Amino acid sequence: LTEENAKTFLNNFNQEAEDLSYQSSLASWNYNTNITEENAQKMSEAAAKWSAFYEEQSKTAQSFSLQEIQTPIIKRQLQALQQSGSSALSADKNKQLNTILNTMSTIYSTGKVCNPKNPQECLLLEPGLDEIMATSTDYNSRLWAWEGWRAEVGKQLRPLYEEYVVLKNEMARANNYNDYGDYWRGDYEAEGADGYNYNRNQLIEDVERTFAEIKPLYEHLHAYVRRKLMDTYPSYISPTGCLPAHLLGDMWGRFWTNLYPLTVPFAQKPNIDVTDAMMNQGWDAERIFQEAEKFFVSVGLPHMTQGFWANSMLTEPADGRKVVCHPTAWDLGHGDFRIKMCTKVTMDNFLTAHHEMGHIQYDMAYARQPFLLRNGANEGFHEAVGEIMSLSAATPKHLKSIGLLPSDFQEDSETEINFLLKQALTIVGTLPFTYMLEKWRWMVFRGEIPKEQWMKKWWEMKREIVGVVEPLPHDETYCDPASLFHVSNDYSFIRYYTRTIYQFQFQEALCQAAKYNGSLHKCDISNSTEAGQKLLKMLSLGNSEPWTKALENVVGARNMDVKPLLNYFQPLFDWLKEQNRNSFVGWNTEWSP
Amino acid sequence: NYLYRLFRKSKLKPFERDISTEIYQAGNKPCNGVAGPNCYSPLQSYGFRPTYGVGHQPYRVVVLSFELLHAPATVCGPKKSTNLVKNKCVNFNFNGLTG
Ligand SMILES: *[C@@H]1O[C@H](CO)[C@@H](O[C@@H]2O[C@H](CO)[C@@H](O[C@@H]3O[C@H](CO)[C@@H](O)[C@H](O)[C@@H]3O)[C@H](O)[C@H]2NC(C)=O)[C@H](O)[C@H]1NC(C)=O
Ligand SMILES: *[C@@H]1O[C@H](CO)[C@@H](O[C@@H]2O[C@H](CO)[C@@H](O)[C@H](O)[C@H]2NC(C)=O)[C@H](O)[C@H]1NC(C)=O
């Protein structure tokens, strides 16, 4: 029978796959920790063998017909195996698409904007332009950096995007999808028992529904940021107008976290930073991870493995091997869980350690599941589980409990307000940019936006949705979205929006589980075993079950809800309402200085 | 060099061993003794590596099975020498003869 044949095929596949995946992951780890040509070539062969085996099994797996398979776990495993992805196209088209992707990656990596009238001062984005966007207050210098990177990247990348869209559309149609946007929206599709069914088309409307609720809080935050920037820039920003694109603290306006010194509510009150306390008590990276482990055992999640302590790097090696700075959690397979982070003794690294340990705990929980189902429920869930631990770790209760913060510390309203504003600038601000960018990409892939009117649509939506106006008019020869890293390197962007919704939903569910009676932002889930079990029920599942079922398992709801996000930011929302009474909340679509 | 049987037509009886390497036929079509789609070699390899998790590290297992039969039992534990005391009234146990 077909189902029994699929079961035997999956049983043979899991044993062969786990070994090959472990070899590929180990070679990738060996390259990441010890960057060299030989580790890179070894990684290349390991990835080549694993990819060739995976495609060969996928081709055999496509022979099976899903109609006569009744059991959901086998059907889900076959669905995961049968996703050809880019292999659906012919060799010529696949090679052309790969060439376009590689040239896009190299050109973005090597992007150059240089000073007019000062030829020697030519700047790359990664070493210096980002520093200019984060720190510089000069209007003309920011206008130069933004316009120059926009001009060079957009003019070079507009044809490449023009055929990139067509090739991705061909690949998606070849994989029985309406467009590349539907192919991306497939990741949130859940097929399961009645009432748990989720559709790709549904996701757009769900995002819009969440956005409408988020929009008053964003409007108040935008008005407050606009007033503070107006204080910083006296005549270049209008009270009723949109914000200029180059004054948002980032190259693209993705994160507003760099506007915190300009937009601080209370300058006099210090931040909750505990780096100096760590310095005084002689803390190190090992102690940071041990404290994170103490938090995870205290909440009731399992202890870290011996292999994790033995094999991971938690410090810069300083023995002559180059490393990647970025913290990454690795699930190599066969019970091997590692973290690569060059941890300095700072508060940010402490929160990052909690986030990566959350990733490792999420990976550890679903190890029981079969190989094809050892993943997150969706892209958002994996990031969200780490983010809730990062949220809980930063609370004053957690810092006081572990002795980082003094026992006699007084929590006034003002520190809560400025901390919440910083959290909003990092978290609330990114949501309109993410929604607008994903909506633009979906409509471009769909063909709803005409080919020759692309730029004209994008700025309008930024005026409509983000409330950010272009500093200078851009015609259609520009490709203004393509300056972002995620779009130029073929990455989905809606995961951050889903991550943001899931993070607050999970945090409220755990706080209700832990019987916390106070404000959501001050909540700590330490020493609440029932909350750990409630979380672990979702963590064990992986993607064996539909993501709606896992969401119901944690929060009791089957869809995205932004009421926890509003509940988290409620004191800040009240404060922003209190201070915006004289001012005008909202923006005008037409360009206002 | 460490192998396990993943596929067998029927479950093993207690204290049974199968050394057959015959291709496991999971499908109606005959395998014909050459590996082919829906035909899998039964013996899979335990690819042990030092960095594996504790669940997957190699473990050596010895099973001791004790059986009693109508024949006289010839496997018994150590016998204590103790020590020999002479010229006094001592309870003696010599090769199962007591007094
Ligand atoms: C979660 O539970 C643990 C264990 O109950 C809590 O750790 C405990 O924290 C309290 C208060 O900081 C400690 O009490 C005091 O400790 C100092 C230092 O030893 C001592 O001089 C005082 O006389 C008093 O005993 C307690 O010892 C400590 N217990 C352990 C085993 O470390 C932790 O604070 C809890 N976390 C949360 C968020 O509730
Ligand atoms: C970093 O990588 C290099 C090469 O990838 C390692 O050097 C090898 O070490 C093994 C073990 O002693 C030798 O058998 C090889 O001949 C060495 N190769 C070279 C080119 O020297 C090095 O040991 C690695 N370092 C760490 C800390 O893992």
Side-chain angles (χ1 to χ4, degrees), chain A residues 218 221 248 253-256 423-434 466:
Chain A
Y218 176 68
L221 168 70
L248 298 198
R254 168 160 141 82
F255 292 119
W256 287 12
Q423 287 283 98
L425 289 176
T426 318
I427 288 157
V428 179
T430 203
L431 295 183
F433 182 80
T434 297
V466 187

Side-chain angles (χ1 to χ4, degrees), chain A residues 1 4-9 11-12 15-16 18-19 22-23 26 64 305-307 311 333-336 338 374, chain B residues 4 6-7 24-28 37-41 44-57:
Chain A
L1 197 140
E4 295 299 324
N5 291 319
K7 283 184 69 173
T8 61
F9 170 72
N11 283 325
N12 166 76
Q15 328 298 150
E16 295 167 337
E18 274 189 56
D19 178 43
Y22 187 80
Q23 290 186 170
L26 187 63
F64 294 104
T305 75
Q306 296 300 111
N311 305 126
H334 290 296
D336 198 7
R338 306 190 193 193
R374 284 176 202 167
Chain B
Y4 63 91
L6 178 68
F7 294 134
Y24 178 69
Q25 192 246 19
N28 294 117
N38 272 353
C39 288
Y40 307 123
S41 61
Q44 301 285 136
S45 188
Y46 266 136
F48 290 130
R49 286 178 179 90
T51 38
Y52 276 9
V54 199
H56 292 240
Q57 311 208 87

Side-chain angles (χ1 to χ4, degrees), chain A residues 224-404:
Chain A
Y224 182 71
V225 162
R226 188 213 299 136
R227 212 165 50 247
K228 284 285 176 163
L229 284 196
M230 170 184 322
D231 187 5
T232 301
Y233 307 98
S235 62
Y236 291 159
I237 305 159
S238 168
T240 190
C242 298
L243 289 175
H246 64 289
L247 303 186
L248 298 198
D250 273 16
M251 177 70 216
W252 315 270
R254 168 160 141 82
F255 292 119
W256 287 12
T257 186
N258 290 317
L259 294 177
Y260 179 71
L262 310 167
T263 64
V264 62
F266 302 100
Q268 297 296 321
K269 289 316 192 172
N271 202 353
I272 194 69
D273 182 46
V274 291
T275 302
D276 61 353
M278 303 183 161
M279 293 297 290
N280 282 118
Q281 299 176 10
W283 284 38
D284 58 307
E286 179 69 24
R287 218 198 192 280
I288 294 292
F289 281 90
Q290 277 175 337
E291 285 287 328
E293 185 192 31
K294 273 172 52 173
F295 165 74
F296 277 107
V297 306
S298 84
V299 76
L301 272 79
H303 292 247
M304 306 303 301
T305 75
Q306 296 300 111
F308 169 76
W309 299 108
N311 305 126
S312 294
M313 63 177 278
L314 311 176
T315 308
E316 275 280 334
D319 56 64
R321 54 178 178 170
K322 302 299 294 295
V323 296
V324 173
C325 193
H326 295 88
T328 304
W330 291 69
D331 181 13
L332 280 81
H334 290 296
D336 198 7
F337 307 96
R338 306 190 193 193
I339 281 176
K340 174 183 73 66
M341 175 195 316
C342 304
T343 303
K344 269 84 66 177
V345 55
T346 53
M347 196 188 166
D348 291 331
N349 283 327
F350 171 73
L351 301 192
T352 311
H354 278 254
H355 185 97
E356 302 291 333
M357 199 168 278
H359 276 143
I360 289 294
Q361 287 274 359
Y362 191 69
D363 288 337
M364 286 172 38
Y366 52 62
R368 291 185 298 272
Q369 299 294 331
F371 179 74
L372 290 171
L373 299 179
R374 284 176 202 167
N375 299 115
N378 62 42
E379 44 182 25
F381 269 61
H382 219 303
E383 299 284 346
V385 298
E387 286 280 345
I388 58 169
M389 320 301 183
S390 168
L391 278 189
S392 303
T395 65
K397 188 206 183 222
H398 187 255
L399 304 182
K400 281 191 303 201
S401 301
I402 67 185
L404 281 182

